[PDB]
């Protein structure tokens, strides 16, 4: 569908740190949240489908996309709680109102699902895909990259990620079924061109995945939003992927129990937005048109 970004980046100061985001259009928000190691750019070919249906917003997580890096960065930085502190503040600053449709992926789903549980009256609908829908076990993690993710969560992670940029350069293309162009890869590597701490968010994220009980704070937060989503009547759109990657097996079985949910299946592994953007955008736009009838 293309390498051109959607709209233009806007910036706003949050906790003294300039965060970047796309905010196009008017009306209630349709809020797209990327995860690791992507940015608002992940949604560039999906957001056009929602033209005219709302205020289309896609924020770049702190340390990612065009958002500022945290300094001094190190292994204690960019944990989920820190990301949430910045993202909650940015969402508050954007004056989103009380009928928000969340469209989430990967860490964007952990953050969005948690935000939704804490601001449930303001959530009109939730569309999710390849999400972190609940705490998992290593047996639930996809086999292809299980050893690599165990390595990220070990002392080997700094060389793999900070030195060699393995998340951007290997994991990202490895979990996209079609070949990316030069320009698309340039957009993904841009925030991470420099070796070292600039790449820290892409290492801190896998170390935060609630797997086999650790980190316990994130396991608790995900246990909470999992229980809440399993009971919430808020309309949901589950965009399942084939073969998919993270939302397969037990997690997919659990997601399929969620109430008031519509599901479509699109081709893709993990970064399914690069494989089936039109199918995904058409589904999201249809979900929003149903939630916002004239």
Q: How far is the CB of 195 from Ca ion (least distance, A)?
A: 23
Q: Which of 37, 4, 5 is nearest to 21 (CA)?
A: 5
Binding characters for Ca ion, 4-43, by CB under 5 A (x = yes): ----------------------------------------
CA distance 43 to 41: 5
Exactly one of 105, 270, 274, 279 is catalytic; name it: 270
176 scored as a contact of Ca ion (CB under 5 A): yes
CA distance 24 to 39: 16
- Report whether 107 belongs to an annotated binding site: yes
Closest CB to Ca ion among residues 8, 26: 26
Q: What does the DSSP 8-state code read for residue 136? A: B
147 scored as a contact of Ca ion (CB under 5 A): yes
Q: How far is the CB of 150 from Ca ion (least distance, A)?
A: 5
What angle do helix axes 106-118 and 80-93 make, rounded to 10 degrees? Answer: 60
137 scored as a contact of Ca ion (CB under 5 A): no
Q: Is 119 a catalytic residue?
A: no
Q: How far is the CB of 113 from Ca ion (least distance, A)?
A: 23
> Residues interacting with Cl ion, by CB under 5 A?
36, 205-206
What angle do helix axes 216-231 and 80-93 make, rounded to 10 degrees? Answer: 50
Residue from 142, 173, 215, 249 binding Ca ion (CB under 5 A): 173
Closest CB to Ca ion among residues 166, 176: 176
Closest CB to Ca ion among residues 150, 230: 150
- Report whether 91 belongs to an annotated binding site: no
Q: How far is the CB of 204 from Cl ion (least distance, A)?
A: 9
> Which one of Cl ion, Ca ion, none interacts with residue 48, CB within 5 to 8 A by kind?
none
**Residues whose CB is less than 8 angstroms from the CB of residue 223 and which lie 6 or more positions away in sequence, other chains included:** 134, 135, 210
Q: What does the DSSP 8-state code read for residue 162? A: I
**Strand, coil or helix: 274:** helix
Q: Cα angle at 149 between 60 and 21, to 5 degrees?
A: 5
Q: Tokens representing 256?
A: 């399929």
Going by their DSSP bridges, the two strands 19-24 and 55-59 should be labelled as antiparallel
Exactly one of 60, 82, 130, 275 is catalytic; name it: 130
Q: Is 83 a catalytic residue?
A: no
- Please tell me the number of Cα atoms within 13 Å of 205 on its side-chain side: 27
CB-CB contact of 216 with 223 (8 Å): no
Closest CB to Ca ion among residues 77, 153: 153
Q: Tokens representing 173?
A: 């293309």
Q: How far is the CB of 137 from Ca ion (least distance, A)?
A: 13
**Which residues form the interface with Ca ion (CB under 5 A)?**
147, 150, 173, 176
Binding-site residues for chloride, in ranges, read 36, 107
Any idea which residues carry the catalytic annotation? 106, 130, 270
Binding-site residues, in ranges, read 36, 107
């Amino acid at each position: 569908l293309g390498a051109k970004p959607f709209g233009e980046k806007k910036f706003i100061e949050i906790k003294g740190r300039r965060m970047a985001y796309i905010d196009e259009g008017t009306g209630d928000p349709i809020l797209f949240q990327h995860g690791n190691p992507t940015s608002s750019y992940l949604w560039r070919n999906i957001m056009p489908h929602c033209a005219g249906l709302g205020r289309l917003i896609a924020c770049d997580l702190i340390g990612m996309g065009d958002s500022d890096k945290l300094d001094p960065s190190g292994p204690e930085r960019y944990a989920y709680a820190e990301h949430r502190d910045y993202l909650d503040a940015l969402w508050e600053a954007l004056d989103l109102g009380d009928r928000v449709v969340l469209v989430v992926h990967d860490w964007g789903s952990a953050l969005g699902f948690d935000w939704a549980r804490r601001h449930r009256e303001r959530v009109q609908g939730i569309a999710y895909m390849e999400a972190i829908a609940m705490p998992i076990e290593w047996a639930d993690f996809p086999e292809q990259d299980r050893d690599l993710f165990q390595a990220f969560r070990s002392q080997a992670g700094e060389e793999l990620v900070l030195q060699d940029n393995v998340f951007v350069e290997q994991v990202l293309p490895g979990l996209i079924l079609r070949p990316l162009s030069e320009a698309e890869m340039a957009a993904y590597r841009e925030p991470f061109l420099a070796a070292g701490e600039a790449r820290r968010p892409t290492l801190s994220w896998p170390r935060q995945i609630p797997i086999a009980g650790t980190p316990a704070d994130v396991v608790a937060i995900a246990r909470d939003y999992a229980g809440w989503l399993s009971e919430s009547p808020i309309p949901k759109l589950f965009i399942n992927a084939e073969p998919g990657a993270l939302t397969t097996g037990r997690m997919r079985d659990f997601c399929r129990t969620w109430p008031n949910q519509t599901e479509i299946t699109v081709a893709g592994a993990h970064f399914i937005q690069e494989d089936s953007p039109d199918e995904i955008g058409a589904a999201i736009a249809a979900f929003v048109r149903r939630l916002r009838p004239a």
